[PDB]
Amino acid sequence: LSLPAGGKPTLAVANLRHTADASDVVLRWRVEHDGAVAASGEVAAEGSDGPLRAGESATIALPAMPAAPLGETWLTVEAVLRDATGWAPAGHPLGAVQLDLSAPAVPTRSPRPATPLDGALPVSLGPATFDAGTLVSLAGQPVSGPRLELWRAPTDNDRGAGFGAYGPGDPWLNSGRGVPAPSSEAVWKQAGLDRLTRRVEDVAA
């Protein structure tokens, strides 16, 4: 998907199949304003002579889709099966693409950075309650935090050490085999990333 300057959204389609044309596929599109459908439709996967042939590509101009003046506007196109097969239902998706059509963002205006004051800490702020500056509740429920975390439960890949690591060198060197190194998990545990401690330096109104 692309939006040529002053143009309308343009969909590039390639049939990368070995033999079958795209007559079994329908291209469905929808535009959503902050996730709510604003418009939608269907087009066929057509080439220069009927259904787009195996190995053929085409480009199609979709309807104009002006941005919502507020919030985000997203176009989604999906290739789906027109008809059920023995193994999938009618409308089974094959793959999809999106394009951001949103009007230039209005970033919300954040509060000015403020100088700390002497004296008493607030005990409550909006939905939050604090006990000597420590969060104890949000919106009627007991809550603690926030607490910095650098640890994640190592994935099986995070635990692997067969290929080398890519960090220490140009990854294109050494046939892309990396540089011999311990697993991520090993270095994370050696650095104590799983057992960070929190020390309060200061608290101020």
């Binding site: 800490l121 006990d131 000597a132 500056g133 420590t134 401690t197 929190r198 020390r199 309060v200 330096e201 200061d202 608290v203």
Partner: protein, 201 residues
């Protein structure tokens, strides 16, 4: 209330007596050893991360006062370690060899800092205030790690050097008859950086 004593890198403060020998003298003396009133706090009062460590209404250093409600406090033998002989009631020993059990960020220590408050009432003979006595000395032969001392509500000083002796001049704080000694002891302090021996903490 100033709790910079906890991270101070100096030798200790207050009414310090010049270092001398441990001697067998016939001077009048008494042992304050015995069962003292004790409580364990999880953090050092008055530090930025300990905003609600103390009971409602208690001031940062209100434990020093002669007017203090310690009725409900447990007792602990002195000398002892609070992490020994108590079936884990006040925590357990921690063994490291080389590694420090806290971040290497001198002179800062963790917020989780077991802090023991000790309160001891004792009697001093009227005769110790007669002109035959020049001064009254309070001696600690070993406290792990840093501690602050109050006598009859008056701050006497702060000690460091866990296996080193420290004497304080309590001539002006003591009285004949009944007296109060209050000692606040922190597990971790700036002194912990100087005390990384291969042994149990």
């Amino acid at each position: 209330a100033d709790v910079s004593y906890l991270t101070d890198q100096g030798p200790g403060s207050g009414r310090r007596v010049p270092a001398r020998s441990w001697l067998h003298s016939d001077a009048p003396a008494l042992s304050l050893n015995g069962d003292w009133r004790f409580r364990l706090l999880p953090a050092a009062p008055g530090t930025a991360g300990a905003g609600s460590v103390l009971p409602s209404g208690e001031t940062v250093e209100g434990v020093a006062a002669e007017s203090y409600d310690d009725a409900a406090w447990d007792t602990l033998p002195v000398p002892s370690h609070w992490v020994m002989g108590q079936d884990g009631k006040y925590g357990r020993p921690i063994y490291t060899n080389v590694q420090y059990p806290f971040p290497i960020d001198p002179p800062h220590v963790p917020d989780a800092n077991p802090t023991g408050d000790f309160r001891r009432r004792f009697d001093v003979p009227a005769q110790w205030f007669e002109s035959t006595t020049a001064a009254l000395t309070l001696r600690f032969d070993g406290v792990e790690s840093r501690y602050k001392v109050w006598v009859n509500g008056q701050e006497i000083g702060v000690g460091s050097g866990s296996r080193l002796a420290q004497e304080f001049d309590v001539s002006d704080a003591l009285r004949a008859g009944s007296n109060l000694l209050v000692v606040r002891v922190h597990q971790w302090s700036a002194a912990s950086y100087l005390e990384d021996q291969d042994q149990w903490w």
